[PDB]
Structure formats: structure tokens, C-alpha cells
């Protein structure tokens, strides 16, 4: 990673390494395995983020989508970005590709070159954004329940059944206004029927908090 | 977080991210999770603090309530700071609002600049007392007892009680006040009829020490 | 904690909070957790004290005593330095109240202040010294055993009698002197016949190592 | 390792150590081991890459294949870059041999030498670069399967075999391209027949993404 | 501890803690423990020498000879620097006594200044020694066996009869030149019959590495 | 250990300490112990390799050989460096003895100053070479094996037996040319009937690799 205020080099740490190995082998794609890893690369080169991809063993369909994914990412970044064809200039740097994002065709010092020049090229926080992409794909790819399928048992407390619908929408893919609509129509109509009839009771613009107290007791 | 005396920043320390988890994993909503909380978000940018939000797995009905208090103290702030349109002059930032505050409309960068200017406008610990506020609702809400039910049993010494007492005391919803008549009213009157006589014989301006120690054999 | 020799702040560690943590967890209120306290709060602000003392979980009754001990020795503080109202000038910080050293009304950036002002006020060493006044009154009262009931039993090795009582005295409320006696008075008088026969005709200025030799082999 | 953006060197840490020694005890020769090896020695000079080679107990065989491997590497060097005689002057350097890029015959000084100068010469990641071939020949060596033997089974879930099937082919001794041939003819064709009558109903162009989501349900 | 040159104070770490404290719990006072103390304590001050004595629990007899030999080592410091009368000069501090090396009336400020000061005044360093002198009393005083007991068996390899008769006189108070004694008449004479012709057979001036050759296939 | 680029001095780390003294609680004598040691000395002066050699609690025999070792080196020394009697001068120090560079009669601060004099007196470095020419005499004594009687089993993979073969040759006590007449002679003729023809079949220069090729589904 990169950190008087000017931004110097450092190598990545073995507690980052063993923290993100045991993260993945323990949670494998969970939801939340993306903060923590954006949690671990903070302030990274590709070198550093290729480094996190490549020390995960197992899993390998996962990261080959994650290939193809930042592939399609860099073709397009390479679309919308043409190289002009010249000598590069002494004060200047190459502007980089797609590939060169990603770290397949960049050495370390022109990645900390791009990221220290003034304007920055944020090469780190671009690939990050790719990556994370990716791993957004694949944490709903391998999400085993559906928002429509979640509905309080019989006797099911209510604070459970709340824990699993917001932690399977957590893992759906949606904006957050299709997000409000989930919240708002199926949340109460998916209640078992006396939770129903208390919260049909409250009114349409109840916070959660209130929802969860009025069926406390229940 | 941000540390000759210039505050820099610094990326979120695997320690911290497994120090948190660890903490939430298992003390669920205990009320010592709280300043621990506190203490492992010194200094935090509204970007470390949504991480530590976000890196938490489960207990999501918590975490939705968390974000709708959060989002009520933005709504607040924002009735309260009212943006002028009008183009940001060089040696100047624009003005927060209650969603750069939050750490999703605004950028790291964003967020170091405020935090570092002179005067400084806090972003972090502002965001930090929205969160410390809606962690004390939880906390709250999930407290399994009353502080009308907490009474001695017939063999238990007066130090188990007393523990059992001001532990639900933490948990409840009071101000300082209320928590003293609390204290100078319930503590005495729900002892054990022994411990209670003796108590009584102390007078009411006891202190706990002295109250613990007249029960102490008995 | 407060660390060219300038004093800078700095952030509580992780690996403090949790030492800390775990050293009242499993030691409770024996009498080395003191120095360990003492240790683990080398430098700290008002804050520092509060954090450490906030993140224990249980022991409430401990906790609300050593809350009312600090607020006797506040009102003492007040008590002996009266505040003098009017305006705080350019170049000066206003005088602590008790509630200030013990870091409920006063910020973070007044503690740094008063800690690295020329004269030092040292707003941390004072609310720590309190707070070890209240730890010391716990660690007394929570002592299960009283010096006068140690007694060597017929088969028991003389060092581990020594030990017993040695830690039973480390847990009494005594001056030096009134402990120079216990020793010279109680150790040799609660032996055994054989040991107490021996130590006897050592004589009155026998050291601690010259008695457990003379009774070794016994 | 080496490190105002002056690079200075620094020892080798206790957690450095550990970490290698204990990924080659728990996984041996798996493919992961290479990047974690290349992350664990950012920066190294040969005396650290030594440090960490010789380090390994066991797996002698392995270890003694990449001597040898150095050993060509090595000598190949010295084939393409000879030496010249004469006497070094003052603001100079000795060009280095294969052996003084390995390790065996420089001293630190002169690896410190090397890798500061302007222009550097940096005798540590060419050595890296000959490690990870050596590494990457014994991955190879002690992989248990070939690609051309992955199929699918009758009851087998889509993704389990097709993460058998990289990780093989992460194995495997193969450029790119073959390896893009690999996964456009073997994949498809070793699928079982209700998968591959999907798969070949998608069509020559399909993405992973979408063969794991047609096959899903399957 | 104290550490461009200058010596600057650092608050003693968590590691160091649960460092010292952890060998003590496991070791007790096995001879190995007396380096590792003074490991743990470079460039410590009298402050971070109580406090690593004072963590200790239970031991107390240990402890209290400790605080014996201390107060002996103190009287005799005393006795050798007699203080002298008068106002102490600005740029001058006040000569130390021996209750002020040993930190119990000095302050942390003051042991500072004594440890650099130009000449430098090394309290640190002679508190040091006096508590290595006590916890090598101690050793002696708990060590379980002779070294005129120490003998081979009949059927006992020579190496594991070497390390019994080498930890016991790591034990054994005796000056360098009683230890060349010992091993010169002791080693050899305590041999079991086989052994001892053989090592007799040796000659007067064998190493031990010649002995333990001899003796190896018996 | 000692590391603007001025080297400067700092004690040994708790990490350290407990790293050596678990690895030789665990390993004993393996070979690898030795890169290990060297590499958790790195910087090391004569007082710190004095530390990790003194905080090994067992093996007193070897740690008593070592000593020898290290006697033997350093009256070496001072037959080939005579000591100059004369009155050290301003600007100069005493030349160091063989005592003074095994850390028993000389102090930190001149152990500093002879590896930070220019030109420099690496007092470290060779304190360490003699350590570990006495580490490795100890190694080779407590080998098991020798290497003529590494022989390849009916039924023993090929890949194991290297594996035998190899470790038993790094405990050898050979120089690189034996160990090359070892490796030419020894391992083709031990080997089983089978792949000893087929390694004959190969001739006298194949690699090791083509060997454990040619022999692998044997
Ligand atoms: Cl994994
Ligand atoms: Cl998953
Ligand atoms: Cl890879
Ligand atoms: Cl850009
Ligand atoms: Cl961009
Ligand atoms: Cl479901
Ligand atoms: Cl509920
Ligand atoms: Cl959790
Ligand atoms: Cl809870
Ligand atoms: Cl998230
Ligand atoms: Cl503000
Ligand atoms: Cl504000
Ligand atoms: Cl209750
Ligand atoms: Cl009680
Ligand atoms: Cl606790
Ligand atoms: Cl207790
Ligand atoms: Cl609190
Ligand atoms: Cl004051
Ligand atoms: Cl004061
Ligand atoms: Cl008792
Ligand atoms: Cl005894
Ligand atoms: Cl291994
Ligand atoms: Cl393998
Ligand atoms: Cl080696
Ligand atoms: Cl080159
Ligand atoms: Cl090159
Ligand atoms: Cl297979
Ligand atoms: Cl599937
Ligand atoms: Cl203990
Ligand atoms: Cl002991
Ligand atoms: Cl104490
Ligand atoms: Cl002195
Ligand atoms: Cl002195
Ligand atoms: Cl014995
Ligand atoms: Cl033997
Ligand atoms: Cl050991
Ligand atoms: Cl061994
Ligand atoms: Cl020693
Ligand atoms: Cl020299
Ligand atoms: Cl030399
Ligand atoms: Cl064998
Ligand atoms: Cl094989």
C-alpha cells in the first residue's frame, strides 16, 4: 500500500494477508467479505490487490468470473480511453490501459508513479472498483434464498425473522429504491397473522424501530 | 483514522476490523460493546466508521435501526444547516451535509479536509454520536430485564444483587436523575428482609460501600 | 496515551484494550491487577481511564464504588482549589474543575492541553491516582481471607505458609510500619510447633531468607 | 527488506518468518504458496529469499530441484552478461555474477549496494524471478491430476466441478493461450449430458457467469 | 524503556506484560528466567522494573526476599553515597539515594534526568543488577538438587546424564573457577562404570565434545 | 539489535524472544534451526546473541559444547589480533579481545561503538559466525542418520526417498565437492532394483528433476 504528508510505498503486512486468507476460508461470500477486504486494501496498488486475489486457493470459479469480470471492465476503460501513439516526454508517464490497471502490464513503479503524480491516476481505486464489482456478482450469485421466500414461522420471533430478511436483502441484487419497495410491501405482508394485524394496526409510515416494539410481546 | 504535530491519516489496522469483529461476535449488544466501540474508533473518518458498520455479519434488524437513526440525525442536521448554491472559491471546501457527514456523498479526500481545516469541522466524531446514539437504542431494546424485577433472593449475597442491579441500571433508559432515585428508592426497598432491616438501620445517606459492608456477613 | 522529545497524543491500542480486558476477566480484583491497571495506562488521558474503565463488562457493584470514590476525591479537589470566574485570556487554559480531571466535562483537546502546558497540569496522573484509591478499597474489600487466621498447618511446607501469607498481607489495609509488624510479630507466632521452635532460636533480627533456610528441611 | 523516500534497509520480521514457514507446513506445493511467497518478500534481498529458502525443513527433494533450477538461471546469467577484469574505482560497484544475485557469494553491503544505486540493479527480484520459475517447476511436479481427466459427475453441482476444473488447470504447465483453448474445448465437452446439452445450447460465445447460471438449477 | 540519536522514554508494551508475566507462571524460577527478565527490561527505568515485579502474583516469598535483598543492596549504596546538604543549582538535579534507584521515591521525571544526563547517572541499570542479584538468591534457594548428586545410571545415554549434570550446576552458587572444579572432578567421576573407564581412558585434558564422542555408541 | 541511514540501536522484541525460544523447544537440533537463529539475529550485538543463547533452558549439554566452541574461537583471535598496551586516545577505542566480542567483558555502549565506528568493527557478525560454527558441530553430532545408509525401499516412492536422502545430507559433515560425490555416487546406487535401472538408463548427467520424472510412476 501507499500511505510531512507526502505518500510513500510500503509492503503489504502478513497480519493483512493471514487476516483476508482466513476471512475468505471462513465466510467464503458472505456479504460481508466485501467491506472487509475493501477494509484490508486500503491505500493499495494492483500489485498489492493482485496479491489478495491470487493467495486464495479454492474457490476457483469464483475468481475466474472475477477474471472475466475486470477483463470486461478493463475492454471497456480501454473503449472509452485511446492511446495516442508518441514517445513519452521527460515530466510525463504513459497513460495507462486496462491491463495496466490491473497490474498484468504495469511494474510497481509505474503504478506508484500514476498514483503520486499531481493530477493523481488513481490506478488502486479503479481496479478496487472493478474487483469489487465482481465480487458483488458473485456474493448474489452464490446467495441460496430469495426476498420472496422469507416469512416469519408461526411462533418465530419477530426480531429473528427480521434478521433474515434483512440479511437476505442485503444479498439481493437491487437499487435502494427497489430496496424501499421490498422494505415497505413485503416485510409486514410476509408477518405471521397476529404480527400482521399488529403492524397492518400502526400505519404505513412506521419506523422499524416502532414495528419491532409493537410485536415485542408477541 | 487521523493522528511535529500535523495530522495525517492512516488506513483501519487489521487489529482494529478483528478486534470489532470479535467484540460484536461475541458480546452481541452488551452495553460494554459501546465505549469498546468507542475506543476502537479514535479518530475515524465516517469511512473507517462505515466500515466497522459494515464489516458486521448478522444482527441486521440492529443494523437497519442503526441506519434509520442515522438517517433521522442527517434529516436533522440538514434542517438545521441549510447548503448556499453558489461555486466553492479556491482555499475553501463546501459545506457538509447530513450525507457527506454519513461518509456516502462524500469522498476520503472530502472527509481529510475537513477534518484537517482550520477551524476544524469534525465530521467523524459528529457521525460517531449519531452512532453511539443509535447503539444506545439497541442497546436498550435488546436488554432482557427491568429494573423493577431486579430483587435479592433469600440466600443470595447482597454483592450478586447489587451486580445484578446496576448492570440492568446500565442497560436501562434513564437520565442521571432518575438513576439516582433509582438507586436512593429501589436498591434498599427490594433486599432481602435481613439485609433490608440493616440497610434501613444505616440511615439515607449511605454510601455503597458502607451498605455492602453492613451486609457483608450476613 | 501521551508519548525531538514533543509530547504527541496517540490512540488507545487494541492490544491494550484487550489485555486490560482479559486481565479483569480472569484475575477479577487480586491485588497484581493494580499494577497491571497502573501499567496498561502509562500516559493516558482522562479518556484513556474512562475507556479502560467503561469497557468492563460485569462486576457493577466494583464499578459504581470506584465511581463514588472518584467523585469524593473531586469534590475534595474542588473543595481545595476554588475557581476564579472570568474570561480565559489568549494564551491560557481554564483551571480544572474535579468533573474536568475526571474527564466527564471536559474535551479531549483541554486534557492535551492541560497535559502539555509549561507548568505541566497532569489531569491523567491525578484522575489515575484516584482511581487507584478505589482500586486499592475493592481490592480490600473482596480479600476472602484476614492476616490474623493464617496459621501453618503440621505437614505444611514453611514456603508455602510464607506464601500465603505473604499475599493475604499484600491484600491488608496497613501502613508499613503497622505491616513491619505483622511481620516481625505474626510469622514466626503462627508456625508450627517444630518450625516456630527453630525460628525462635534464630532470634528476633532473622531475615526472610535465613528463616526458610533454617526451616527447609523440615 | 528494503524500504523522505530514501530506501533503507531493515531486517527480516519474527511474523515474516512464521507466516512462511507455516504456509509451506500446512499447504506444501499448492499453487497459492507462490504469490504468498512473493508477497512475504517484497523488497528482499537475496539474503532474505535465502533466509526463507533455507528455512523450510523437510520437502529436500523439492528444495534441492530449486538449487538446480538457480543453479542454471544462474549460470545462464553470467553466459549473457561477462565479466570484465580490471580494478573497481572509487564511485563504483563490481558487476555481478550468478552467484552474487543468488546470495552465495555477495555480501549484504554489496546486495544493499546494488539495489540503492542510480541506475539499481536489482539483484533481489531477479532472484525472486528465478525462485518463483523453480517454485513454479515443483508445482507442477506435484500436482496429483491432469485437465484432460476433470469430468463431471452424474449427480455433481455445476460449480464443484468446474472448481475442480480451474483449480487443475491453475496447475497445470500451459501458456495463456493453451489455456484459453483448455477452457473453451474441455469444459464444455466433460460436462454430464444435462449440463452439456445446455452448455452447448448457449452457444461458442458464453461467459462463466452464464453457463454456472444455466446450469444451476441442474 | 528509554530508546537521530537521542534518548527518548516509551511506556512499556502490552507483549513485554504478558510476556514476563506469562514466563514466570510457566518457569517459576528455573535458572533460564533470569536472562529473560533482563531481555524484557533493556533501558528500562526503576518505574518499568517495579511494575514488571509488581505484576507478579502469588510467589510472595520470592518476592518478599526480593524486596529484601533490594532494601541490603539500597542501605549499602547509602552507606558508600553519602548525600550532601544544600539547594540543588539550575542545571544540576539532586544525587539519587537507594530508595530512589530503587523507585520508590523518585518520580518518573527524575529517573529520566538521572538516565540522560551528560555524564549519565544509570539507575536503571544498577536497580537492575541489585534485582538479578535477589532473583539468583532465589534460584539457588528453589533449586531441587546437588551436584554432588548427580550421577549416572546404569543404563543412562551419556548425553542425557551431561544435560542433568550441567542444568544443576547452571543452578549451583559457585564462582567460574569451583565450576571448572566441578567439571574437572565431578563430570567424570560420576560416570557409570563402561563410561567412566572410557572417559578415564581419554585423558586429563578432553573437551567435552571428545567425551560425549567416546561415550556416544555405549 | 542495531538498524536518514544512521544506525542506531534498539533492544530485542518479545516476537524474537519467544520466536527462538519456541523453535527450540520444538526442533531441537534440526538443521533448520540454524538458518533461523541467523535470521532472528540479524543486526544483532554480542549482548543479544548472549540473550537468545542464555534463554535456552535444557539442552545444557549442547549450550555447555557451545561454549567451547566460542572459547576455542576467541583464544584463536587473540593469537592472530595481539593486544597493544598504551592509553587509549580521544577519538579512538580499545581494540577488542576475544572475550570482548563474545560479550563477557565488554559493555553495550562499547559493542556500539565498534559496529558503528568507520570503518567498522563487526563484533556482531563474527560473535555470530563462531555461534554457528558451534551450532552446526552440535547439528552433525545429534544426527541420527548417516547418509550410507539412506536406502530406497521395495515399495518406497522415489520422491520420499530423495526427501530421506537429502535431509541426512544437509546433516552431513562434508564440503560441497563431497556432497557432490555423494549426490553422484550414492543416490542412483541406493535406490530400489527398478528405478536404479532406469536411472542408469538416463546416464551420468541427469538432473534431479528428470530423475523424479523418470522414476515417478514407478
Ligand atoms: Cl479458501
Ligand atoms: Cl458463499
Ligand atoms: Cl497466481
Ligand atoms: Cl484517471
Ligand atoms: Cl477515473
Ligand atoms: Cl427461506
Ligand atoms: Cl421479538
Ligand atoms: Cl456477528
Ligand atoms: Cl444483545
Ligand atoms: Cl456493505
Ligand atoms: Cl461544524
Ligand atoms: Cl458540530
Ligand atoms: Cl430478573
Ligand atoms: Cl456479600
Ligand atoms: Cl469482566
Ligand atoms: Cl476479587
Ligand atoms: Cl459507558
Ligand atoms: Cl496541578
Ligand atoms: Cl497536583
Ligand atoms: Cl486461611
Ligand atoms: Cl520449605
Ligand atoms: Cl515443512
Ligand atoms: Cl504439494
Ligand atoms: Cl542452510
Ligand atoms: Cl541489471
Ligand atoms: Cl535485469
Ligand atoms: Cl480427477
Ligand atoms: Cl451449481
Ligand atoms: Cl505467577
Ligand atoms: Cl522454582
Ligand atoms: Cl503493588
Ligand atoms: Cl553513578
Ligand atoms: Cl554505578
Ligand atoms: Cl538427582
Ligand atoms: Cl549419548
Ligand atoms: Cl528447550
Ligand atoms: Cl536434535
Ligand atoms: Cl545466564
Ligand atoms: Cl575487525
Ligand atoms: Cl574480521
Ligand atoms: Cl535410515
Ligand atoms: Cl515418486
Same mark, same amino acid.
Given at each position: /500500500?501507499?500511505?510531512?504528508?507526502?505518500?510513500?510505498?510500503?509492503?503489504?503486512?502478513?497480519?493483512?494477508?493471514?487476516?483476508?486468507?482466513?476471512?475468505?476460508?471462513?465466510?467464503?461470500?458472505?456479504?460481508? $467479505?466485501?467491506?472487509?477486504?475493501? =477494509?484490508?486494501?486500503?491505500?493499495?496498488? /494492483?500489485?498489492?490487490?493482485?496479491?489478495?486475489?491470487?493467495?486464495?486457493?479454492?474457490?476457483?470459479?469464483?475468481?475466474?468470473?472475477?477474471?472475466?469480470?475486470?477483463?470486461?471492465? =478493463? =475492454?471497456?476503460?480501454?473503449?472509452?480511453?485511446?492511446?495516442?501513439? %508518441?514517445?513519452?516526454? /521527460? %515530466?510525463?508517464?504513459?497513460?495507462?490501459?486496462? +491491463?495496466?490497471? *490491473?497490474?498484468?502490464?504495469?511494474?510497481?513503479?509505474?503504478?506508484? %508513479?500514476?498514483?503520486?503524480?499531481?493530477?493523481?491516476?488513481?490506478?488502486?481505486?479503479?481496479?478496487?472498483?472493478?474487483?469489487?464489482?465482481?465480487?458483488?456478482?458473485?456474493?448474489?450469485?452464490?446467495?441460496?434464498?430469495? !426476498?420472496?421466500?422469507?416469512?416469519? %414461522?408461526?411462533?418465530?420471533?419477530?426480531?429473528?425473522?427480521?434478521?433474515?430478511?434483512?440479511?437476505?436483502?442485503?444479498?439481493?441484487?437491487? +437499487?435502494?429504491? $427497489?430496496?424501499?419497495?421490498?422494505?415497505?410491501?413485503?416485510?409486514?405482508?410476509?408477518?405471521?397473522?397476529?404480527?400482521?394485524? !399488529?403492524?397492518?394496526?400502526?400505519? /404505513?409510515? *412506521?419506523?422499524?424501530?416502532?414495528?419491532?416494539? *409493537?410485536?415485542?410481546?408477541?
Amino acid at each position: /500500500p501507499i500511505v510531512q504528508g507526502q505518500m510513500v510505498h510500503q509492503a503489504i503486512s502478513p497480519a493483512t494477508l493471514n487476516a483476508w486468507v482466513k476471512v475468505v476460508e471462513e465466510k467464503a461470500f458472505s456479504p460481508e $467479505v466485501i467491506p472487509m477486504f475493501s =477494509a484490508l486494501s486500503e491505500g493499495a496498488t /494492483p500489485q498489492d490487490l493482485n496479491t489478495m486475489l491470487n493467495t486464495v486457493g479454492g474457490h476457483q470459479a469464483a475468481m475466474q468470473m472475477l477474471k472475466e469480470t475486470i477483463n470486461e471492465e =478493463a =475492454a471497456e476503460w480501454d473503449r472509452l480511453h485511446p492511446v495516442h501513439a %508518441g514517445p513519452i516526454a /521527460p %515530466g510525463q508517464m504513459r497513460e495507462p490501459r486496462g +491491463s495496466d490497471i *490491473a497490474g498484468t502490464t504495469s511494474t510497481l513503479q509505474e503504478q506508484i %508513479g500514476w498514483m503520486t503524480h499531481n493530477p493523481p491516476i488513481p490506478v488502486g481505486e479503479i481496479y478496487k472498483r472493478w474487483i469489487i464489482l465482481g465480487l458483488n456478482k458473485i456474493v448474489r450469485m452464490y446467495s441460496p434464498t430469495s !426476498i420472496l421466500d422469507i416469512r416469519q %414461522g408461526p411462533k418465530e420471533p419477530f426480531r429473528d425473522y427480521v434478521d433474515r430478511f434483512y440479511k437476505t436483502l442485503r444479498a439481493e441484487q437491487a +437499487s435502494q429504491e $427497489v430496496k424501499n419497495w421490498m422494505t415497505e410491501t413485503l416485510l409486514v405482508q410476509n408477518a405471521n397473522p397476529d404480527c400482521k394485524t !399488529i403492524l397492518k394496526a400502526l400505519g /404505513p409510515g *412506521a419506523t422499524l424501530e416502532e414495528m419491532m416494539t *409493537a410485536c415485542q410481546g408477541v
